[PDB]
């Protein structure tokens, strides 16, 4: 749509009540924002942080006013620097982002590293500041994510770069990540939220149903039968919104056997 | 209820212009494709395939047809294999697969070689008690490693799929039933009677549901090609919803719930 | 494992406080039982039933004294007759549960109900159990695990027949098509299920957890990979080379680079 | 060598009976299916699709045709998108076509018109070409090959960007993301496209169909395996 | 004809250098690898795997061999698995049976247990004797096979029975194995090689190229790109036996650039 | 890792004894190097070359002192120009299932069968003179195995079809841009930079690298991939106490007792 709308000021309302490690805000125009708020530790998550993010995300998913989720870190220095070095419920969170019917965007300034780097990849889109830094650390610190951290990363950057990223554990700047297709765009640090909000509003103008259907379709290319469950799940929901889909329910209400003879067969 | 399911069938001939097949439609919406070459045990040649592609294309587009029966003429053979391309039966195989209406193999006598892959491709197989199944390719050198191999495994399992292909034995109806190759076995005389019952049980059901499920069961096998079928049904469904039609007429989408 | 241990009496302890639609019980020896408790309506689930079952399975999961979960219906006439779409979440949750889940089925397992039992790792059926779908009969479908996974159990011909015709199948037909693991007399249903549960409790829970993730991994693509690899990660922490990283730069030279 | 690849093409018309498409053949083996509705920016309607299915079926069955070009009339559009969904049949057809199909794109390749170019084995883009999806903007989606297969071309991050926002992408953006195979100035679109077709025509047509089936088989599961073992069978008739 | 199939078998010893296995060849193309440690019920130690790998490799490359039998010494045990008194190189042996371009038949008498059960599963076919006993033990003894021992079992018996076999670690007799499709046939113990040899001979009647392509094709439903590799390998092989496949080599002989215009372009 | 350590000279020790077509060397710090040594025929392989690469790669796998294998061609003109004028499929699986990272070091030609080999390696380090391509369709052959499907998992399906259907040659820069190689370095520095990448991987956990290698194959190789990935899990399981309990039970005569282990969520 028009830039005037897209770059309009963002109003965030606080819904962080009871959260220790994260902030949770909503805009009136449909965006929910989850902020890892541990900037002293470069926004490393600990098990509490994960549990809170799971709650915030369950909430965003169930809130009809919300159509897009942003995941970010407080400050300019880190998105998320990984698991806290000082059990593995972050897997749950990965699943939860994967199966969330609304687009989830990673708004990344500075460090996205380790468990934190898998977090941004799990998100549908990544918006990077020009100061953003990406990479894995597992093999360097005796650990690994060989699940979506591995196979899904390949589906993003190809198998030669996935092997480089994991095996060597180097760091990559924003341009390097842009070039290998690891992030969707690179924007100046001062404009990060401006542009991220723009991208969200662009999606918000589009069909929520279409967006969830394509999301599941894109997962379905990776997640075998789990993907099929999402994709058919939307198909079922769509069916219930058609007349033939409503006959069974109308039949029961009217105390009669369903009659499918009165419906056209398509080719 | 038996009375309805076992009521007689009114077949109308639709075989106009076909040499190798007969093609019939019933008033209650059953289309039957019959290979009409029992002088060569119902083996197909390219023309036979080309005509089956036509019939099935007709059935697919006919609003009155819900279920297709594929069968052979007579009692001795369903299809004993191959003898307008050398291998167009592959095309016909796909078209059974992506056909949004259930296809049922009505098998009397022999279902061998290419003829055996054909009944397997059908969503269901009703077998007469005189039915015989098996592959032969390996004997003469030929073979089917596509759905002829992989998809057979998703029916009978990997041990028996290797057995059937590697030895190329013949199996009677009882053997086929116990390994899950056919859905049921009936006395030869009642073969059509039971097939029509199965067909009618399907006709009482939601055609849109049948078509989505069939696409879903295919999608466990056909990777991105199965996804195409399944998502295409979703797209189709979408256009019948209010939200889908709102985008067409334009687009204010905020008036539709962002469901969890 | 001798019969005397396996067929010992079972002590259930009620954990049902705050549950309106379900019962939730635990045994001394590590079995968590989730019982759908709406027999007036043949044990159909509404959204409340699903939310409670999710809660109870979440609890069973995080309880270290639980090794097996039994899912069942109250009474002798129905396991679950289907819906009265959050049941998708419950399905996902049964799938990724690191402990064996057992459907214990008496009478009707139908529709959404039938998909629940299939989702469970095993199914012990009473001789009075009935199975089948009803979607196409009532204008709906389950085309996720309800379809693909059914095929990985009974094969594609049977899967197509079950769905397309929506017939009903007795315990005998279900057993013969591989749909259930075993059929026992109605009176012995819990007795025999507890036995299967106890036999699993005698085995390595870490082994069961890996194998389950591994069996899922043959159906669930990268989602199965996430589970399996996640177990590998868990195992890795429990080793010295995995511990070395957390303990100055790390040094892995003191470790074999095996073949 | 450049002189051969760049020689003039001898087109022969085969557009008999077609309202919405042109269909031409060269002596050296190229078939060209042109969408001929430039007024509506080469959008397809059920007839167009029915006619493209016919032409593509012809090309597949002609021993003289080695390569097929799919394109739009004029310099402003390739195809700006759309029984109802017989374009799904045409997708399947492009997929299983045992010969390379090359999308020659000038101007817009949008919506269903975008999926069509993706479905082609190769895409040769003019410098004025524009790409994107529109479904979520216009209450539709292609979550079949339009989704998964897009991922296999551009990666999951770009595929989600393309579908979720439905922006437009210029030729350079398309090239850079692996979406098209090359970009040429508009005046050279067909000249360069024909060269690519002629480089494939110098190669083994059996080798090409086997490789296309193999690349498909990385996506289409048992349907990929069927294409693949179909070729092995056709190979095993060529032996003793 | 039953006269040919049940004719006497002439076995030729080729066990030179082996300590844990016998290795024989018949004059009509069957290779038989026999695990020979019956005092420990044919459990394999690392040396047993090394020798089974050599023997298998030899059978694969011997053009005179069309079919391979895997079996154990005596009537009481096929193979009861890893030796408790004791690298993980049975995975190599597993992979070798998988990619073996010839049919491999597990001839099972008595126990096929743990890793020994996994070996019989990997074999294309299994001929069991009425005394045969099957099952896993991993969870009973703190171990597991999660690769082919899990996933591929599922493709034999289905997900319900696979979960049963692995989770409970019971034993199953011959009738039970037959019923769940775990084995191809059950025969009397006295007749075990009589019958097994018959099956082998029914396979020798057919084309080795055809068998090879079908084995590859059926592996291809399970093994992703690895399967495709076997499948294409055969296709590349078939190709060379054609004119168009020979046209490249004849171009380089005649010192000319290849010409492919003279070949039809089938539909 | 510091630059001084990474760019330290490399001491290679010859291990090529009995090898005709290949050299095989090992450095003290854990790199093995298989060099195709037929520069006269642009380092193309004949059957014996493949037999020796199998042996040498088998050795590197079983040598516990080695953690990374480099694959390369002699001289600066070629890496491998492919088949000469099917056991190379065995060497392919062997690179695939090698629990240690395998790096292709490419100078000059990597072509045909020689091109599939570089793609098969986990990483590819390319010199600025490197040339990549297929030739099969031009000469009436094809690799429709990992040569096709896996190629697409590197460069995308549009480039995969372009590379196969046309059989052109691509310079280093083109190879780098479609993501076919990992980096392009000046020819003079080829081994300097290559050994650097190996050392960085050698500073990391060998157990981590093999799991992650299996996990990434497992996105391609179906149940075969699951066998690699589960095999590593089984292995790690033996290294835990719960896994040792089984065998400990047998050695102490008793029935195993798993009740004393935490049933985690
Ligand atoms: Cl030893």
Q: How far is the CA of E44 from the centre of ligand 1 (A)?
A: 9
D93: left (phi over 0), alpha (psi -120 to 50) or beta: alpha
Characterize the bridge pairing of strands E21-26 and E11-13.
Answer: antiparallel
CATH code of residue B9: 3.90.226.10
- Only one residue has tokens 């896996």, namely F150
B157 is in an annotated binding site: no
Candidate from C225, C229, C246 with C-beta closest to A85: C246
**Lookup: tokens for C109:** 């397992």
B111 is in an annotated binding site: yes
**Greatest CA separation found in chain A?**
67
CA B259 and chain centroid, separation? 37
A55 is in an annotated binding site: no
Which class for A84: exposed (0-12), middle (13-18), buried (19 or more C-beta within 10 A)?
Answer: middle
What angle, rounded to 10 degrees, do the helices at E148-157 and E115-122 form? 60
Chain F contact present for A158, CB below 8 A: yes
Ion ligand 1 nearby residues (CB, 5 A): E 45-47
Determine the 3-state secondary structure of F129 from DSSP: coil
In a domain, E135, yes or no: yes
E strands in chain D: 11-13, 21-26, 30-35, 67-72, 77-79, 101-105, 108-110, 122-126, 130-132, 169-170, 182-184
In a domain, C157, yes or no: yes
What whole-number distance in Å separates Cα of residue D148 and Cα of residue B114? 32
F34 is in an annotated binding site: no
Characterize the bridge pairing of strands F109-111 and F78-80.
Answer: parallel
Q: How far is the CA of E48 from the centre of ligand 1 (A)?
A: 8
H or E stretch covering D230: helix D221-236
Please, what is the end-to-end C-alpha distance for chain D in angstroms?
38
- B98 and B165 in a single domain? The answer is yes
CB contact under 8 A, D158 and A152: no
Distance from CA of A167 to the nearest CA of C (A): 14
What whole-number distance in Å separates Cα of residue C126 and Cα of residue B231? 39
Characterize the bridge pairing of strands F68-73 and F102-106.
Answer: parallel
What whole-number distance in Å separates Cα of residue F98 and Cα of residue F189? 27
Characterize the bridge pairing of strands D21-26 and D30-35.
Answer: antiparallel
Q: Which domain holds residue F150?
A: 1-202
Enumerate the residues of chain A whose CB falls inside 8 A of the CB of residue F182.
Answer: 160-161, 164
A52, A90 Cβ separation under 8 angstroms: no
Contacts of B42 (CB under 8 A, 6+ apart): B35, B72, B73, B74, B77, B78, B79, B80, B110, B115
Q: How far is the CA of E47 from the centre of ligand 1 (A)?
A: 5
Chain A contact present for F156, CB below 8 A: yes
CB contact under 8 A, D164 and A207: no
Candidate from B183, B213, B230 with C-beta closest to C157: B183
Number of cross-chain residue pairs from B and E with Cβ atoms under 8 Å apart: 92
Chain D contact present for E221, CB below 8 A: yes
CB contact under 8 A, F215 and C225: yes
Characterize the bridge pairing of strands E185-187 and F31-36.
Answer: unpaired
Distance from CA of D61 to the nearest CA of E (A): 5
A24 is in an annotated binding site: no
Which class for D123: exposed (0-12), middle (13-18), buried (19 or more C-beta within 10 A)?
Answer: buried
In a domain, F259, yes or no: no
CB contact under 8 A, C218 and E169: no
Chain E residues 224-243 with a CB less than 8 Å from chain C: none
D139, B246 Cβ separation under 8 angstroms: yes
Closest residue in C to A221 (Cα) is C221
What whole-number distance in Å separates Cα of residue C93 and Cα of residue C81? 20
Which subunits have 3 or more CB–CB pairs within 8 Å of chain B?
A, C, D, E
Q: Which is nearest to E91 in space by CA: E149, E166, E23?
A: E149
H or E stretch covering B4: helix B2-5
- A220 and A100 in a single domain? The answer is no
Judging contact as 3 or more Cβ pairs under 8 Å, the answer for E and A is: no
A217, D152 Cβ separation under 8 angstroms: no
DSSP state for residue A100 in the 8-state scheme: -
| C-alpha triplet B163, B165, B168: angle, nearest 5° | 90
DSSP secondary structure string for all residues of B135-195: --HHHHS----TTTTHHHHHHH-HHHHHHHHHH---EEHHHHHHHTSSSEEE-GGGHHHHH
Chain A contact present for C143, CB below 8 A: yes
Q: How far is the CA of F51 from the centre of ligand 1 (A)?
A: 27
- A117 and A82 in a single domain? The answer is yes
A51, A104 Cβ separation under 8 angstroms: no
Site from B213, B226, B259 to mutate, C interface, most C CB atoms within 10 angstroms: B213
- Only one residue has tokens 């292995």, namely F235
A16 is in an annotated binding site: no
Contacts of E20 (CB under 8 A, 6+ apart): E35, E36, E37, E44, E45, E47, E48, E51
SS3 of D11-79: EEECCCCCCCEEEEEECCCEEEEEECCHHHCCCCCHHHHHHHHHHHHHHHHCCCCCEEEEEECCCCEEE
Enumerate the residues of chain F whose CB falls inside 8 A of the CB of residue C222.
Answer: 219
Q: How many residues in chain C?
A: 259
A42 is in an annotated binding site: yes
In a domain, D2, yes or no: no
Determine the 3-state secondary structure of F42 from DSSP: coil
Enumerate the residues of chain B whose CB falls inside 8 A of the CB of residue C154.
Answer: 180
Sheet of B30-35, strands arranged across: B11-13, B21-26, B30-35, B67-72, B103-107, B124-128, B184-186
- A101 and A232 in a single domain? The answer is no
CA E79 and chain centroid, separation? 14
D96, B94 Cβ separation under 8 angstroms: yes
Number of cross-chain residue pairs from A and F with Cβ atoms under 8 Å apart: 88
CA E75 and chain centroid, separation? 20
- D40 and D117 in a single domain? The answer is yes
Closest residue in D to E207 (Cα) is D240
Which subunits have 3 or more CB–CB pairs within 8 Å of chain D?
A, B, E, F
CB contact under 8 A, F64 and C256: yes
Rounded CA Rg of chain E: 21
In a domain, C256, yes or no: no
Candidate from F140, F143, F230 with C-beta closest to E232: F143
CATH code of residue C213: 1.10.12.10
Determine the 3-state secondary structure of C60 from DSSP: helix
DSSP secondary structure string for all residues of C192-224: HHHHHHHHHHTS-HHHHHHHHHHHHTTTSHHHH
Q: Into how many domains does chain B fold? A: 2
**Lookup: tokens for D56:** 């593509």
C106, C129 Cβ separation under 8 angstroms: yes
SS3 of A170-222: CCECHHHHHHCCCCCEEECHHHHHHHHHHHHHHHHCCCHHHHHHHHHHHHCCC
- Only one residue has tokens 């299915």, namely D53
- E246 and E174 in a single domain? The answer is no
Determine the 3-state secondary structure of A95 from DSSP: helix
Q: Which is nearest to C197 in space by CA: C72, C54, C31, C75?
A: C31
Q: How far is the CA of E19 from the centre of ligand 1 (A)?
A: 11
- E8 and E111 in a single domain? The answer is yes
Enumerate the residues of chain D whose CB falls inside 8 A of the CB of residue A182.
Answer: 157
Q: How far is the CA of E46 from the centre of ligand 1 (A)?
A: 5
What whole-number distance in Å separates Cα of residue D82 and Cα of residue D104? 18
Strand partners, F24: F34
- C162 and C238 in a single domain? The answer is no
Q: Tell me the helices (H) and strands (E) count for chain A, helix number first.
A: 11, 10
Closest residue in F to D229 (Cα) is F144
Q: Where are the alpha helices (DSSP H) in chain C?
A: 3-6, 47-62, 87-95, 112-119, 148-154, 156-165, 171-176, 189-201, 205-216, 221-237, 240-246
Closest residue in C to A87 (Cα) is C234
- D55 and D159 in a single domain? The answer is yes
- A111 and A237 in a single domain? The answer is no
Distance from CA of C10 to the nearest CA of A (A): 32
CB contact under 8 A, B157 and E152: no
DSSP secondary structure string for all residues of A47-90: HHHHHHHHHHHHHHHH-TT--EEEEEESSSSEEE--B-----TH
Chain F contact present for E47, CB below 8 A: no
CA C254 and chain centroid, separation? 43
DSSP state for residue E139 in the 8-state scheme: G
Number of cross-chain residue pairs from A and B with Cβ atoms under 8 Å apart: 111
CA A86 and chain centroid, separation? 27
Which class for F58: exposed (0-12), middle (13-18), buried (19 or more C-beta within 10 A)?
Answer: middle
**Lookup: tokens for A33:** 């924002």
Q: Where are the alpha helices (DSSP H) in B22-108?
A: 46-61, 89-98
**Lookup: tokens for F117:** 């080999």
In a domain, E25, yes or no: yes
A27 is in an annotated binding site: no
| C-alpha triplet E71, E77, E83: angle, nearest 5° | 95
CB contact under 8 A, B154 and C158: no
Q: Where are the alpha helices (DSSP H) in B36-88?
A: 46-61
CB contact under 8 A, D156 and A152: yes
CA E92 and chain centroid, separation? 13
In a domain, E266, yes or no: no
Q: Which is nearest to B81 in space by CA: B42, B126, B46, B128?
A: B42
Contacts of B52 (CB under 8 A, 6+ apart): B21, B33, B35, B44, B70, B92
Contacts of B249 (CB under 8 A, 6+ apart): none
Q: Which is nearest to F208 in space by CA: A113, C238, A139?
A: A139
F43, F57 Cβ separation under 8 angstroms: no
Q: Taking the CA atoms of D91, D95, D96 and D100 in sequence, report the sign of the dihedral they define.
A: positive
What whole-number distance in Å separates Cα of residue C162 and Cα of residue C133? 7
Strand partners, C131: C109, C169
F85 is in an annotated binding site: yes
Which subunits have 3 or more CB–CB pairs within 8 Å of chain F?
A, C, D, E
CB contact under 8 A, B150 and E217: yes
- E88 and E57 in a single domain? The answer is yes
- F177 and F164 in a single domain? The answer is yes
Site from B203, B205, B237, B245 to mutate, A interface, most A CB atoms within 10 angstroms: B237
In a domain, F264, yes or no: no
DSSP secondary structure string for all residues of F187-249: GGGHHHHHHHHHHHHHSS-HHHHHHHHHHHHTTTSHHHHHHHHHHHHHHHHHTSHHHHHHHHH
Strand partners, D25: D12, D31
Enumerate the residues of chain A whose CB falls inside 8 A of the CB of residue D156.
Answer: 152, 155-156, 218, 221-222
Contacts of A93 (CB under 8 A, 6+ apart): A50, A53, A54, A57, A119
What whole-number distance in Å separates Cα of residue F50 and Cα of residue F84? 11
């Amino acid at each position: 749509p028009d830039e005037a709308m897209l770059y309009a000021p963002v109003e965030w309302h606080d819904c962080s009540e009871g959260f220790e490690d994260i902030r949770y805000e909503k805009s009136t125009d449909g965006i929910a924002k989850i902020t890892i708020n541990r900037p002293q530790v470069r926004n490393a998550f600990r098990p509490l942080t994960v549990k809170e993010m799971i709650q915030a995300l369950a909430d965003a998913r169930y809130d009809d006013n919300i159509g897009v989720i942003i995941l970010t870190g407080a400050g300019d220095k880190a998105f998320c620097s990984g698991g806290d070095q000082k059990h593995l419920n972050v897997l749950d969170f990965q699943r939860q982002i994967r199966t969330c019917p609304k687009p989830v965007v990673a708004m990344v300034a500075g460090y996205s590293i380790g468990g934190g780097h898998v977090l941004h990849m799990m998100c549908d889109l990544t918006i990077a500041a020009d100061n953003a830094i990406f990479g894995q650390t597992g093999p360097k610190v005796g650990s690994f994510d060989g699940g979506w951290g591995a196979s899904y990363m390949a589906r993003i950057v190809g198998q030669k770069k996935a092997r480089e990223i994991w095996f060597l554990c180097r760091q990559y700047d924003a341009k390097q990540a842009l070039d290998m297709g690891l992030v969707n765009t690179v924007v100046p640090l001062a404009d990060l939220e401006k542009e991220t909000v723009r991208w969200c509003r662009e999606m918000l103008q589009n069909s929520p149903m279409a967006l969830r259907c394509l999301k599941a379709a894109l997962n379905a290319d990776c997640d075998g039968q789990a993907g099929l469950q999402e994709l058919a799940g939307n198909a079922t929901m769509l069916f219930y919104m058609t007349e033939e889909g409503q006959e069974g329910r109308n039949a029961f209400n009217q105390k009669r056997q369903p009659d499918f003879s009165k419906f056209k067969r398509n080719p």
